[PDB]
Design a protein around this ligand. Structure first.
Ligand SMILES: *P(=O)(O)OC[C@H]1O[C@@H](n2cnc3c(N)ncnc32)[C@H](O)[C@@H]1O
Lengths: 294, 976, 76, 76
């Protein structure tokens, strides 16, 4: 079987699973055994829930058990608490031909008690301890920007809709409109500057920064210290695609080595290239240590 | 000025101008029955300059049915004189006096508004003529059993400054056409919301600068997003920008005198299913005086057929227009009685009309209002012998409902949730009704304490009752009003944590629940409890002059949770962070900054100081959490710890520089001010305002205010003594050196290192204390800091600043409230409670109520029946459920359903938990199958089962025999 | 036929309907003109609350009839 | 060949398409059943946003592949 076929057959069974995120504690309390961003809000919510939330979450789980996207380019994996459907973690692999390609990005999802009337809360965890802004819509503090995620005035076809909006829609929105091939033009106003040499240089600078950021945090830190929920998924994904990842990073290196027209962009590109070489050496060191999954 | 600390909530409803006008108005109230007492109470709580209580009748046993300030010892005394002493304590800013002399012409000239109750026809006509001739506002109010009548005559020329009470709406302009019918188009296809024929003004318009600050112009709404302002060819071409703001145009109307208005009446419809009722009620009320004149001043006897026939004949003789004879007979049969909730509602309406007359705000009744509550009567009526008086304080109520309904009321048990304004009014009405005075009881619960701002609309509390529990104080207050009332009060907040007291046994002996809460979570929880226990629930809510009642009947109507309300509007992340365009965004940003700076930055440090073993506890946390806590503790305790107030001032200055200079310079570096997109529109156009960094000036009051507030709060956080001297802080802040800023384009080892630095350098003798945001205290400087921060960020983006009043309204999430709306909605809710207690089940009798006292507007509807669904041909609603008894294993539970109900359970849940599912791990599924359901619930919910829990509620998603999902009722699992 | 819808806050809306439309169509038109989703709208007429799945003929709403768009409130 | 498309709510729909069909043709076919106008739609496959003019054979979309329907976003 081709490597793509093996990847598709192996990652299919593990798209939607449950994990022990919460365990029993003393004096009728509970503690988190995994790092969840919305732990404080979970504790504040307590046992409050809207009557329709249970039915909506059951339908969402039924949808997610089959409907998650899966391809050799990108895939989405969802883990939920074994006893609570409203606490979830999402792993999204970067699409090919993008600066995020073959990078594992982790999100925390918490469904408020008012769901599905209020939109769910999602936060990006793969931020490099808030030192990296991976996208104009992905602030370094972890906040994710989407029009679908807001109930503010907006437009009816753009707001969060209690009937025509779903978790799967939000996941696909992130995975295909945030991880775009050219993230620089995501910012409004910059969208019309594309096609000009200055816009091309700015996009190249942004992509050069994102290249090293993703190589460091989306690959190296995920291999070294994977999340407990996505440990074996991450291991399988990085073991099955180590050659493609190495080739892609080498191609990124060669592209960054091309001459530049402006010195201001050239200095930043050279610095990002040296950082990317430093991180790629470590990534090559780590990849060779990956014991092949059974 | 107006004492904001007392009138805080009422100011957001009325306004400074309206309250100033009411503070110069004298009120005369004639008649001190139940309705007059309610009017006086609401007016006094409103805060008029003075009120004079005039009455000629003496207190009797029949007056105790609604007068809560009269006792049996007051029988024989003048009602006004007896109630004046107690009414004066409601508001010390209002001068309350009592008058017993005749209403001479010279005496009437001293009052701006005159209210007439229980006055005869001749006196009413004379006083109305005199008031109309001399420009005195006149209001006539009456209540006869379950009927009401309100008349308003505010003079020949009355000016209204705000016709509807709604805030002006401003929209932003995208393009204006330059021709004879210039069309204004809104920004990025956003609805303006302007009404047709509105008046608007323009500001911040470039090119058409002549429209800036122009007089209001009549508009023509051509669509949901565009409108026309007339000829715009005389001005210059439109470049960009522009904001159109709605302007409230005053209106002048003329009121007919009573002598004229009787023959050509204009009716305000109170119920749209009874359009013909006001016409008959007008004639009935007019002919009541003739009947009294023809029967020695005696009203028709309660439920007497002969007197009803005589009154019908009098009505026939008095008027030639056709009238509802059945309605006339029903009016005559119960016209001699009097009840509390109707009096409260009519008093609330009449007090709003008094405030309207005094201040000139809101539209008055034009001109007659007639209301009835005939659905509260039994379908078969009341026997005459049952309605005879028995020498009791409820005689006027027995004249309406009979002695059997009084016995039913005495044995009723009702639960009131929340003891706020609505809760206090409901408690008063229940006490006056005689509810629970026999073998019944009245339960009231509230977790809050009395605050000074609560005294404005809660009449059961006194200035010396501050810091006392609301529920106990209200219980004692209504115990004084009616000694026979049995009340049990709790200081608990309803929820999952207080089910030990509010257990299933407690709800089992209840007859109904009345909601007086201010949040949706408590409402939803009380609905779930009422659904599970199958008891009626009455829900009430108010907002300013708006209010509603909803009634939920088991097996009859849908629940409050069956329908949905608009969500709380949140602010886009990019609108709060980088591109604010309204004062709300800056206020929310200031609140977030306050929280993050003065509360979140010190919680970990305080926990570390208080708990010696905090480090070992946080060393076991998963992920990067131990580092994220240790570095915050280090930053709060070593790096940023100020050793003197001078360091606090320096930190405040640096924070000001970073917030209003450095970050804005960075933002402008990222996006140049003159950046223009390819198609032509600049980036800093439309909803995005180009900012400009500020220059610090100690002479600027805003900068000094921010420095003062921030330094004092920072000193309070670390325990340093505050220096509340503006001159000293101004002197100190001038010596601070601001560093230059330029724009820019092993974990275990670290944990051990930070632990070592904490145990060596950090001192546990510090007094780090996070600050809790309090808005009602003017000496804590929280609101001052919020105002300074918001106004500085507004001046950053050229957003018009907001004063302390609007900042407190928005940032503090203050819900405006007034006493009149509360009284009206409480009266309506008590009417629905009476309907429920009677025994009505058909949905026509029950009425959901909606009101807006500003328009004025009042409307009703039948509650919607519960939705019906079918599984295997069996109909079920939200009230039906499965009944599973005994102790069963999980496998036994699934087999029971699969065998009896022919349903295959694919997802079993208990609240937020998930006991069973189709996608659960096989190991846990095998483990949980043989265990009893109680043990499974205990394991999944991670909490013990309390002994008071006698049953559990399960929600199941099932598949039929054919493999398709079907909706099924919830399961009630009875513990052995 | 033309009908009017009055909001609880006193704003008047004019709709162009037919004696045979459905409450869903009326709510969609109200959504177009105002912006509230249809599931958040409560239409009162002649003491009755309009429910989805019915037409105006059942409620006897004729020309120049007035409807009321009410809402629930969270204070107390 | 046959392809599936999963809509906003997770509801899966079934379509018939040519190998040479433009993505605009596919968008029109989805509108023929569910009606969001094509310039508002966004079609997702293998993480890439499909552009109107290319054929499915350009993206190597093949029989029984599943597509995802999402909408054009707007900035924070
Ligand atoms: P307004 O805010 O004047 O009146 C509301 C009162 O209800 C009390 N209250 C709110 N929420 C609860 C719960 N869950 N349990 C008990 N009491 C509640 C507030 O404290 C106000 O007194």
């Amino acid at each position: 079987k081709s490597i793509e076929q093996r990847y598709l057959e192996l990652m299919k069974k593990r798209q939607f699973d449950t994990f022990d995120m919460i365990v029993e504690s003393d004096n009728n309390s509970f503690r988190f055994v995994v790092s969840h961003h919305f732990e404080k809000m979970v504790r504040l919510a307590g046992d409050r829930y809207h009557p329709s939330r249970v039915k909506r979450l059951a339908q969402e789980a039924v949808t997610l058990s089959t409907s998650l996207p899966l391809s050799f380019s990108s895939s989405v994996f969802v883990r939920c608490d074994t006893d609570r459907l409203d606490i979830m973690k999402v792993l999204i692999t970067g699409p090919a031909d993008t600066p995020y390609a073959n990078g594992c990005f982790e999100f925390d999802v918490f469904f408020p008690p008012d769901y599905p009337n209020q939109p769910m809360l999602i936060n990006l965890e793969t931020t490099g301890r808030h030192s990296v802004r991976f996208n104009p819509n992905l602030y370094n503090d972890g906040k994710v920007c989407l029009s679908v995620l807001n109930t503010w005035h907006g437009r009816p076809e753009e707001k969060w809709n209690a009937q025509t909006s779903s978790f799967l829609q939000v996941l696909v929105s992130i995975q295909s409109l945030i991880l775009v091939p050219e993230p620089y033009f995501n910012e409004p106003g910059f969208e019309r500057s594309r096609g000009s040499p200055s816009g091309t240089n700015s996009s190249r600078e942004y992509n050069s920064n994102i290249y090293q950021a993703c190589v460091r945090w989306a690959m190296l830190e995920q291999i070294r210290s994977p999340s407990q929920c996505f440990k074996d998924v991450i291991h399988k994904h990085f073991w099955l695609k180590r050659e493609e990842i190495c080739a892609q990073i080498e191609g990124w290196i060669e592209e960054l080595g091309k001459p530049q027209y402006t010195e201001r962009a050239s200095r930043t590109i050279s610095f990002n290239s040296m950082v990317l070489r430093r991180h790629y050496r470590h990534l090559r060191e780590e990849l060779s240590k990956l014991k092949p999954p059974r | 000025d107006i004492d904001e600390s007392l009138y805080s909530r009422q100011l957001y409803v009325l306004g400074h101008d309206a309250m100033r006008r009411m503070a110069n108005s004298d009120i005369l109230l004639s008649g001190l029955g139940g309705l007059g007492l309610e009017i006086a109470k609401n007016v006094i709580l409103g805060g008029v300059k003075s009120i004079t209580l005039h009455d000629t009748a003496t207190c009797g046993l029949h007056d105790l049915s609604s007068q809560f300030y009269l006792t049996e010892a007051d029988i024989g005394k003048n009602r006004a004189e007896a109630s004046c002493a107690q009414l004066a304590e409601l508001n010390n800013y209002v001068r309350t006096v009592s008058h017993t002399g005749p209403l001479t012409e010279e005496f009437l000239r001293k009052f701006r508004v005159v209210v007439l109750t229980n006055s005869d026809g001749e006196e009413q006509q004379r006083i109305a003529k005199f008031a109309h001739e001399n420009g005195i506002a006149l209001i006539i109010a009456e209540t006869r059993g379950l009927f009401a009548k309100v008349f308003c005559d505010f003079g020949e020329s009355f000016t209204i400054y705000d016709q509807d009470g709604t805030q002006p709406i401003s929209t932003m302009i995208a393009s204006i056409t330059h021709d004879a019918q210039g069309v204004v188009t809104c920004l990025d296809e956003t609805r303006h919301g302007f009404n047709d024929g509105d008046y608007v003004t323009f500001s911040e318009v470039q090119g058409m600068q002549e429209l800036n600050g122009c007089q209001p112009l009549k508009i023509t709404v051509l669509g949901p997003y565009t409108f026309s302002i007339g000829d715009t060819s005389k001005f210059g071409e439109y470049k960009s920008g522009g904001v159109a703001t709605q302007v409230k145009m005053p209106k002048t109307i003329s009121f007919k005198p009573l002598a004229q208005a009787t023959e050509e009446p204009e009716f305000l419809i109170s119920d749209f299913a009874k359009l013909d009722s006001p016409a008959t009620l007008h004639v009935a009320f007019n002919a009541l005086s003739c009947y009294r004149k023809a029967h020695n001043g005696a009203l028709p006897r309660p439920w007497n057929e002969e007197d009803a026939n005589s009154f019908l004949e009098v009505v026939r003789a008095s008027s030639n227009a056709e009238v509802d004879e059945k309605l006339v007979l029903q009016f005559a049969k119960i016209c001699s009685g009097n009840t509390c909730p109707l009096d409260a509602a009519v008093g609330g309406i009449v007090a709003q009309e008094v405030l309207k007359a005094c201040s000139g705000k809101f539209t008055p009744i034009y001109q007659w209002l007639y209301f009835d509550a005939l659905e509260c009567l039994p379908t078969e009526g009341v026997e005459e012998a049952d309605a005879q008086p028995v020498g009791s304080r409820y005689d006027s109520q027995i004249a309406i409902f009979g002695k059997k309904f009084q016995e039913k009321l005495a044995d009723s048990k009702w639960f009131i949730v929340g003891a706020g304004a609505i809760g206090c009014e409901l408690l008063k009405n229940f006490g006056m009704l005689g509810l629970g005075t026999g073998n019944g009881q009245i339960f009231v619960t509230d977790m809050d304490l009395i605050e000074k701002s609560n005294l404005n609309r809660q009449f059961l509390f006194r200035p010396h009752d501050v810091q006392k529990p609301k529920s106990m104080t209200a219980a004692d207050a209504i115990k004084r009003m009616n000694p026979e009332v049995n009340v049990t009060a709790y200081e608990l907040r309803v929820g999952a944590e207080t089910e030990k007291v509010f257990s299933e046994d407690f709800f089992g002996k209840l007859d109904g629940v009345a909601n007086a809460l201010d949040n949706v979570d408590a409402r939803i929880y009380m609905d779930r409890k009422c659904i599970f226990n199958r008891i009626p629930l009455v829900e009430t809510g108010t907002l300013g002059t708006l209010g509603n009642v909803q009634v939920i009947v088991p097996f009859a109507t849908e629940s409050y949770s069956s329908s949905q309300d608009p969500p709380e509007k949140s602010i886009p992340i990019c609108t709060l962070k980088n591109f604010p365009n309204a004062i709300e965004h800056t206020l929310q940003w200031a609140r977030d900054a306050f929280e993050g700076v003065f509360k979140q930055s010190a919680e970990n440090a305080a926990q570390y100081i208080a708990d010696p073993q905090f480090t070992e506890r946080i060393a076991k946390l998963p992920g990067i959490q131990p580092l994220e806590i240790l570095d915050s503790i280090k930053k709060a305790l070593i790096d940023d710890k100020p050793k003197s107030f001078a360091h606090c001032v320096e930190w405040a200055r640096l924070y000001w520089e970073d917030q209003y200079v450095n970050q804005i310079k960075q933002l402008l570096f990222n996006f140049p001010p003159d950046q223009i997109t390819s198609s032509g529109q600049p980036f800093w156009s439309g909803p995005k305002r180009c900012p400009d960094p500020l220059v610090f000036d100690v002479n600027d009051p805003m900068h000094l205010d921010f420095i003062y507030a921030a330094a004092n709060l920072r000193a309070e956080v670390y325990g340093i003594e505050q220096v509340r001297n503006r001159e000293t802080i101004a002197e100190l802040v001038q010596k601070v050196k601001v560093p230059e800023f330029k724009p820019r384009s092993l974990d275990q080892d670290r944990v051990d290192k930070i632990i070592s630095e904490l145990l060596k350098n950090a001192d546990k003798s510090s007094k780090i204390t996070p600050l809790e945001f309090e808005k009602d205290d003017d000496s804590n400087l929280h609101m001052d800091f919020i105002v300074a921060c918001s106004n500085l960020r507004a001046a950053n983006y050229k957003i018009p600043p907001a004063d302390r009043h609007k900042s407190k309204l928005i940032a503090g999430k203050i819900i405006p409230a007034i006493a009149t709306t509360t009284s009206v909605l409480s009266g309506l809710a008590v009417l629905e409670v009476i309907k429920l207690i009677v025994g009505h089940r058909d949905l026509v009798k029950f009425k959901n109520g909606f009101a807006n006292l500003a328009l004025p507007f009042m409307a009703f509807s039948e509650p919607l029946p519960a939705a019906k669904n079918t599984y295997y041909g069996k109909e079920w609603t939200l009230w039906d459920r499965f009944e599973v008894t005994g102790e069963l294993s999980l496998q036994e539970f699934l087999n029971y359903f699969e065998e009896n109900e022919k349903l295959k359970i694919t997802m079993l849940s208990q609240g937020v938990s998930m006991l069973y599912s189709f996608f659960m791990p096989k190991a846990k599924c095998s483990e949980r199958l043989p265990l009893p359901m109680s043990e499974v619930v205990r394991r999944v919910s991670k909490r013990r089962l309390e002994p008071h829990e006698r049953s559990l509620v399960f929600e199941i998603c099932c598949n039929d025999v054919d493999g398709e999902d079907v909706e099924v009722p919830y399961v009630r699992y009875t513990l052995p | 036929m033309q009908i009017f819808v009055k909001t609880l806050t006193g704003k008047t809306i004019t709709l162009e309907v037919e004696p045979s439309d459905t409450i869903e169509n009326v709510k969609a038109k109200i959504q177009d003109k105002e912006g509230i989703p249809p599931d958040q709208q409560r239409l009162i007429f002649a003491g009755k609350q309009l429910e989805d799945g019915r037409t105006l003929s059942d409620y006897n709403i004729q020309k120049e009839s007035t409807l009321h768009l009410v809402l629930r409130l969270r204070g107390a």
